[PDB]
Symmetry: C3
Subunit: 257 residues, 3 copies
């Protein structure tokens, strides 16, 4: 408590530095209508400014993560570098803290892109996924081409996009669309989020930022960005605490930004 609800579509609860974001339209398999878009983007935006949130778990209520877009202009940048549909996925990558998704049942189209905004994905072996867009005469346009490219082979992605074929959770892990197969992906994500929540929050945030930016920089610039990030951390209060806690084999007690 509180259960924070956005647009009757997304619920957020926070405990012990972990936020759990739940797509909550179980009766329509969390399909992406207008209010679900608003709900997702608003939930992620809210989380920018909650103090002390160190990790996010993102999952779906009911039987599926997200059945994709609901049947019932694009180029305008309404959310910084994104449009609204793209932000539903991108807000997770732009959050300063890591996002761990837990995927079960169907995860199609927009739903697969939204999950792909997370840092890391747990999934059931028997989940059903698809890069569904070509079926509707469209292309993936909710940031998939920016999010998939560091995890999925070029050939695999072209195939799955042109055929829009379904693949399982097990295949998803092997293809790079998910990170770990688990019978209870929510339990695995929550365990991992707890672990993340024990670490220096500044260091975790700096790492996320480097992971986010390094693919698009030249080697020279990666090197400078590493050194600039390390300069904010070295000899700071939470860094000296990490070392001390390290040395005393205890958990660090950190100040949250």
């Amino acid at each position: 408590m509180p259960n924070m609800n956005f647009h009757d579509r997304v619920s957020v609860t926070i405990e012990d530095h972990v936020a759990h974001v739940l797509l909550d339209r179980a009766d329509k398999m969390n399909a992406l209508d207008d209010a679900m878009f608003e709900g997702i983007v608003a939930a992620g935006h809210h989380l920018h400014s909650v103090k002390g949130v160190r990790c996010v778990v993102l999952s779906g209520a009911g039987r599926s993560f997200c059945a994709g877009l609901d049947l019932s202009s694009l180029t305008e940048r309404t959310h910084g570098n994104a449009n609204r549909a793209q932000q539903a996925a991108m807000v997770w990558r732009k959050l300063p803290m890591p996002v761990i998704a837990a995927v079960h049942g169907v995860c199609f189209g927009g739903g697969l892109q939204v999950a792909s905004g997370a840092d890391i994905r747990f999934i059931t072996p028997d989940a059903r996924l698809a890069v569904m867009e070509v079926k509707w005469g469209l292309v993936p346009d909710m940031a998939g081409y920016a999010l998939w490219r560091g995890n999925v082979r070029d050939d695999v992605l072209r195939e799955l996009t042109y055929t829009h074929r379904e693949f399982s959770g097990e295949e998803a892990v092997r293809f790079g669309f998910a990170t770990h197969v688990a019978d209870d992906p929510l339990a695995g994500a929550m365990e991992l989020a707890r672990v993340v929540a024990e670490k220096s929050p500044n260091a975790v945030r700096g790492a996320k930022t480097l992971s986010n930016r390094a693919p698009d920089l030249t080697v020279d610039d990666v090197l400078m960005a590493e050194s600039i990030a390390q300069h904010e951390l070295m000899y700071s209060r939470n860094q000296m605490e990490a070392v001390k806690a390290g040395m005393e084999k205890r958990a660090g007690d950190f100040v949250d930004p």
Copy 2:
């Protein structure tokens, strides 16, 4: 019919929106002489402007896909961003429609790069491949460094290039040089090409273009290119048809660009 023949080296036949391109110099294991280069580049160029071709299958006549270069200036850009040797591989990636290669027997050097121009590769388990160039005191210069990098690990590629060692079709799939192991790679490629040929041709083409360009763009630019591509598709005639055919569980009837 017609069997279109280019320079007595490459044959192209088209049926039900699928073009089959056959390297046809079986008696020299489709080795890359001057006429084979001309033949390949001319065949790919011809296919730019054939209306209604929705997928290409690329394969070799006789016992091997391509034994590589035939024993018996480089920097000049004769084919847009490529020289002639590079275009033999690059023409497949620059074609608006997907190219599916089917690889068997030997596939060495230039032959491996030509195959690597395709979107997707089927291969026999017992094929023999090699990044052969270092053996001749050369480097791979027929676009391999542009084509391999989204499918093959950095470490794997440096090793195979420096040692020029042979690897099997099974290894090729695991390393990322091919997509699927099949006893009859041509039959698998043709099946996949048929599937591709059922889809909205505009959507398939937009997807290929995003897959082609997204690795070299910043995140910001990937996002804009996604939205710009989607804007050409949404509410167009073939997109409305895809949705309708989708809804009526039937095959779409599309107008070819």
Copy 3:
């Protein structure tokens, strides 16, 4: 003989065109103190200008490759695009010839980044590795984000960095932190280095340079850099020798740059 020793921390010996670089502070598990940094960077620098070195093997004395940083400004570029800590890893990637690392025991933090500067890594199945930095409230800043990105998935790297968890040599190969599992990684690296040492040294060096630069170039520029590199090799003396030796089924006899 000679055993060249740098700062009492690194030993280098050269035979039959292979340099063996040994981190030699076995009694502190080759941990990275001030002198070890100096030792590494000086050893790599020396190797730039030794004529006839065609491959390098990098390994650790005693029980571990490198236990990482020793407890007992960052942004200044002291070694071209790197600071000193980054150069301990980067010098291996900037050397004109390939570097093959052999990893056993513990390989943590800085030690993992140093190994990651090599082109290719052999490792024991039961090695212990970790992206350790978050434990000390830091981020990886010894070039890991530039070196890991062509071998390791985005999701895997974010996980291992945030949790700083230990993973085995077997896992390392599957994750992309190492290339081959071997019970005797030094014996495997030395065998591979011998093979590399038989090849045209100009061709091997050109290949390393393309592998190094191609990830950061546009497709257009990769194509030009391939053609420019090939132009230095084609019809040169060592290239004509490779072909001849090729044709006569013998080892090439090359002039070293």
